[PDB]
């Protein structure tokens, strides 16, 4: 029996149903663009469960006993079995609004509202947007356009490792006891990513020292000429607040969204140009006692996190977010030194990071 929850499934990167899930992911993305939250969620849960299968679907009989597969989803699977393609996903790929939204939001600093605004102005290409003399761009969008080609190219593991070295070298200069962990997709075993994310924590730093680290590290990189873009969001973390009730919980830890200059010489790969590459990097600083909750939240995937929080609420009467775990029956906050302890508190078998690709 396959569970309806991604947190009770092992989802590895050997996806045997990419033909089905690529189509479901496109339909889910279109429903996000069309602001249809419900239809989006149904396609995301169906795609997620098929990603967990240890075999490819080759007939409709193979879908028996699989949860999260409604009639609409089963019609899409049937169509792919029939001709090897999804007519529904093909129509989304050829839709002008979908194409514009994907293209415009591929720029760093451009979200749903700006993409919609540009579309309703009649823009269809990034060339026409950039060269327009009436348009006004945010500092984030300026960086997004300036380093577009580098940011649209996939970050590989030798590059992520080169960034990790830079992060660790800068961090230990100001906090020598600090623990730096690469999170996101690369922690889950992915070969590529659009960015490189890190969690930083220190067992001996004060509240002030931990607040100043991201400012010190970014000033050091600015001095070294490696900081191409920097936005530091101060913490809004509340030590004694109950965890979030929301479907998608907000992270209140101090964080920064960066673009770093990665010199080619620092990358130790199998393999020209300007000799450097712009890399999107996110840094998160958390208090030492909350490191397991933050690690669990930042490792992902987004679907794994949604189902973890849904399972905690609906099955265990517990409240989980990136900062804490609260037991509503015992009326106590639950402590954890590792992700394993969080899973044990929830009554879940431990799911390895490479098994969280839901």
Ligand X SMILES: O=C(/C=C(\O)C(=O)O)/C=C/c1cc(C(=O)c2ccc(F)cc2)c[nH]1
Binding of ligand X by 301 (CB under 6 A): yes
Q: Which of 144, 184, 243, 287 binds ligand X (CB under 6 A)?
A: 184
Q: Residue length, the chain?
A: 358
Part in contact with ligand X (CB under 6 A); list of ranges 12-20, 85-93, 155-163, 292-300:
292-300
| Residue nearest to ligand X according to CB distances in the complex | 300
282 is catalytic: yes
Binding of Na ion by 260 (CB under 5 A): no
**Closest alpha carbon to 296 in 334, 335, 322:** 322
Binding of ligand X by 243 (CB under 6 A): no
Structure tokens at 314: 């609906």
Return d(Cα 189, Cα 354) in angstroms, integer.
5
Return d(Cα 139, Cα 305) in angstroms, integer.
31
CB of 294 to Na ion, least distance (A): 24
Which letter, b or e, does each residue of 140-164 get, where b requires 16 or more Cβ atoms within 10 Å of its Cβ? bbebbbbbbebbeeebbbebbbbbb
62 is catalytic: no
Binding of Na ion by 114 (CB under 5 A): no
Pairing of strands 276-285, 254-263: antiparallel
**Closest alpha carbon to 98 in 171, 178, 175, 26:** 26
Binding of ligand X by 287 (CB under 6 A): no
- The interface with ligand X within residues 308-327 (CB under 6 A) comprises 322
**Helix crossing, 96-105 with 18-33: angle to 10°?**
90
Binding of ligand X by 251 (CB under 6 A): yes
**Closest alpha carbon to 116 in 34, 183, 193:** 34
User: Of residues 22, 95, 219, 282, which has the active-site annotation?
Assistant: 282
Q: Which of 243, 287, 297, 353 binds ligand X (CB under 6 A)?
A: 297
263 is catalytic: no
Q: Which of 105, 211, 212, 235 binds Na ion (CB under 5 A)?
A: 105
Q: Which residues carry a binding-site annotation?
A: 185-190, 194-197, 282, 297-298
Binding of ligand X by 193 (CB under 6 A): no
Return d(Cα 172, Cα 178) in angstroms, integer.
6
Interacting residues with ligand X (CB under 6 A): 183-185, 197, 251, 297-298, 300-303, 322, 358
Rule CB under 5 A: which residues touch Na ion? 105, 110
Active site residues: 195, 197, 282
């Amino acid at each position: 029996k396959i569970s309806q929850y991604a947190c009770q499934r092992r989802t590895t990167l050997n996806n045997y149903n990419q033909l089905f899930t690529d189509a479901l992911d496109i339909l889910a993305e279109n429903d996000e663009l069309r602001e249809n939250e419900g239809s989006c969620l149904a396609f995301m849960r169906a795609s997620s469960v098929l990603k967990s299968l240890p075999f490819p679907i080759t007939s409709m009989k193979d879908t028996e006993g699989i949860p999260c597969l409604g009639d609409k989803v089963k019609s899409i699977i049937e169509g792919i079995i029939e001709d090897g393609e999804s007519s529904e996903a093909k129509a989304v790929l050829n839709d002008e609004r979908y194409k514009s939204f994907k293209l415009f939001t591929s720029v760093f600093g451009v979200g749903l509202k700006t993409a919609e605004k540009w579309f309703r102005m009649g823009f269809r290409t990034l060339s026409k947007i950039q060269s327009d003399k009436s348009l006004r761009f945010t500092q984030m969008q300026k960086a997004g356009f300036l380093y577009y080609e580098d940011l649209v190219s996939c970050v590989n593991r030798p590059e992520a490792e080169a960034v990790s070295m830079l992060v660790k070298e800068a961090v230990v200069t100001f906090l020598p006891d600090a623990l730096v962990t690469m999170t996101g997709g690369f922690r889950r075993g992915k070969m590529t990513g659009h960015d490189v994310d890190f969690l930083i924590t220190s067992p001996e730093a004060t509240e002030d020292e931990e607040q100043q680290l991201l400012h010190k590290v970014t000033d050091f990189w600015k001095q070294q000429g490696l900081l191409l873009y920097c936005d530091i969001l101060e913490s809004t973390f509340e030590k004694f607040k109950q965890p979030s009730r929301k479907v998608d919980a907000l992270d209140h830890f101090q964080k920064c969204f960066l673009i770093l200059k990665l010199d080619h010489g620092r990358v130790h790969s199998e393999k020209e140009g300007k000799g450097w590459k712009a890399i999107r990097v996110d840094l998160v600083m958390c208090p030492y006692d909350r490191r397991a909750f933050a690690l669990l939240g930042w490792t992902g995937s987004r679907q794994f996190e949604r189902d973890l929080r849904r399972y905690a609420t609906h099955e265990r009467k517990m409240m989980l977010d990136n900062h804490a775990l609260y037991d509503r029956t015992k009326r106590v906050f639950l402590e954890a030194e590792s992700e394993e302890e969080i899973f044990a508190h929830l009554g879940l078998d431990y799911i390895e990071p490479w098994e969280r690709n839901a």
